[PDB]
């Protein structure tokens with residue numbers, strides 16, 4: 001969502017999000033670092049192709065044609081420069097000139113040193129408490145985004161980790177149709193479609209980058225939770241990692257984990273969908289967690305088996321029509337977990353990524369809330385690892401990522417919503433070590 005420089009009436013009125021970098025002659029002189037060679041302000045490139053019929057409300061939702069309902073001029077940086085103002089480097093590059101190559105390694109959380117485990121956890125909690133230096137977050141839709149006077153932007157500061165939650169919520173929220181209207185729910189800009197894996201990849205990349213700037217530790221990397229153990233229990237659910245069960249309320253996190261102190265954001269859906277407002281930075285309840293806890297559906301009371309990862313990784317097509325949660329022989333739909341691990345669709349089956357979510361039977365098992373549980377990071381870095389193994393084995397075959405008629409938000413050239421600057425699914429559909437500056441220390445079945 002948007003840089004605090006662009007959360008102004010001037011930027012919103014002119015639809016131009018092109019903040020200065022180093023304005024030495026005065027304001028406006030170095031938009032996108034044009035004075036240096038770093039980039040230029042220019043038109044926003046948005047997807048123009050058709051989406052599936054499932055969404056009938058074109059013209060009504062600000063996530064259509066993202067980000068054009070807010071801005072149509074943005075930064076484009078040259079070469080390997082990057083950033084909302086071209087002030088940083090593309091993933092994998094560092095140095096003032098973005099010419100020094102960088103590669104970090106994401107390891108299994110359970111292989112980290114006791115000092116690195118403590119570090120990761122203190123880093124997360126610091127993320128949860130630290131104001132995000134760049135991004136501010138909308139509380140109203142674009143109709144209302146400049147306040148009743150048209151001069152008060154409807155934005156709040158938000159923490160580094162609450163922004164990670166908020167974007168995920170904003171990618172998934174119902175489309176508001178009007179007070180007394182039933183908000184429209186057959187849309188998902190980050191799930192149930194091919195953009196799933198690329199959306200969550202960029203989601204995790206942005207957190208990692210943010211936590212690197214927060215810690216001032218360029219080599220900081222996100223660990224992963226290997227959940228394909230077929231375990232009855234959640235082996236990262238201990239007071240030195242993520243937190244174990246609270247002995248006083250079995251659905252809460254142990255008071256001897258700092259994650260028992262976290263307060264979630266974005267759980268007031270009925271406010272959002274009846275008033276036409278957005279999730280803001282006011283937190284409320286505590287995390288709920290209850291691994292293997294949903295007695296009603298035994299299918300989600302055990303984590304994915306190792307052979308699930310093995311099997312989904314032999315599904316050789318990235319996706320298949322209708323490019324939705326009912327797609328068969330789709331690796332994307334399989335690892336997401338609406339298909340069984342062989343690729344066979346079943347409306348009754350939940351597997352791999354979705355099974356891991358529902359196994360927590362709590363905040364992490366609800367789509368609008370789940371990043372509130374920090375297991376989400378590790379659940380999703382492991383997912384991105386699986387993805388990144390698939391990109392390795394099938395030579396990053398993007399030919400199956402459909403250029404048109406996917407669910408709205410999931411066509412290849414769609415700017416993943418609501419990431420800023422605009423970034424398409426294509427820019428993520430690359431092998432991580434040589435294109436994104438990170439790699440996974442990880443061993444697969446056979």
Ligand SMILES: *[C@@H]1O[C@H](CO[C@@H]2O[C@@H](C)[C@@H](O)[C@@H](O)[C@@H]2O)[C@@H](O[C@@H]2O[C@H](CO)[C@@H](O[C@H]3O[C@H](CO)[C@@H](O)[C@H](O)[C@@H]3O)[C@H](O)[C@H]2NC(C)=O)[C@H](O)[C@H]1NC(C)=O
Nearest residue numbers: 011012013014015016043044067068069070071072073142
């Ligand atoms: C890119 O955006 C420009 C600014 O529009 C803003 O951004 C959009 C994303 C959207 O959010 C919109 O609601 C925002 O206002 C657009 O430039 C504007 O274009 C107007 C005409 O198309 C223009 O107007 C002028 O002329 C009429 C005369 O009939 C007057 O009524 C008016 O007062 C203005 O003088 C307006 O000035 C102009 N803004 C500029 C140039 O900064 C631009 O069209 C748009 N391009 C796209 C979407 O392709």
Ligand SMILES: *[C@@H]1O[C@H](CO)[C@@H](O[C@@H]2O[C@H](CO)[C@@H](O)[C@H](O)[C@H]2NC(C)=O)[C@H](O)[C@H]1NC(C)=O
Nearest residue numbers: 139267268269271272277278279280281282284
């Ligand atoms: C942030 O979101 C919360 C929750 O959606 C808003 O709090 C609600 O405010 C309305 C009107 O005052 C009431 O229903 C309650 O007081 C709140 N709801 C709940 C569930 O607590 C809050 O006002 C929002 N912040 C802004 C600036 O709009």
Ligand SMILES: *[C@@H]1O[C@H](CO)[C@@H](O[C@@H]2O[C@H](CO)[C@@H](O)[C@H](O)[C@H]2NC(C)=O)[C@H](O)[C@H]1NC(C)=O
Nearest residue numbers: 290293294295296297358360361362363365366
């Ligand atoms: C966690 O699991 C519990 C039960 O195992 C869920 O609670 C049941 O949900 C059904 C809906 O299918 C309700 O009809 C029952 O009344 C609930 N019973 C009990 C005892 O809770 C609960 O919804 C799950 N929560 C999450 C977040 O997954």
Ligand SMILES: *[C@@H]1O[C@H](CO)[C@@H](O)[C@H](O)[C@H]1NC(C)=O
Nearest residue numbers: 004007136137153155156157
């Ligand atoms: C966020 O914090 C600033 C100070 O950094 C505060 O003055 C302001 O009210 C907030 N700005 C926005 C855009 O929310």
Ligand SMILES: *[C@@H]1O[C@H](CO)[C@@H](O)[C@H](O)[C@H]1NC(C)=O
Nearest residue numbers: 054322324325326327328345
């Ligand atoms: C997938 O869902 C769409 C619409 O819900 C439908 O066209 C298609 O038949 C579904 N796939 C099935 C039922 O296997």
Ligand SMILES: N[C@@H](Cn1ccc(=O)c(O)c1)C(=O)O
Nearest residue numbers: 350354357364365366367370
């Ligand atoms: N609702 C999904 C499971 N799920 C839960 C929470 C999520 O964040 C997510 O991405 C998926 C399902 O129906 O299986």
Ligand SMILES: [Zn+2]
Nearest residue numbers: 040042076077
């Ligand atoms: Zn350009």
Ligand SMILES: [Zn+2]
Nearest residue numbers: 168190191200
């Ligand atoms: Zn998600």
Ligand SMILES: [Zn+2]
Nearest residue numbers: 353357370380
């Ligand atoms: Zn998920």
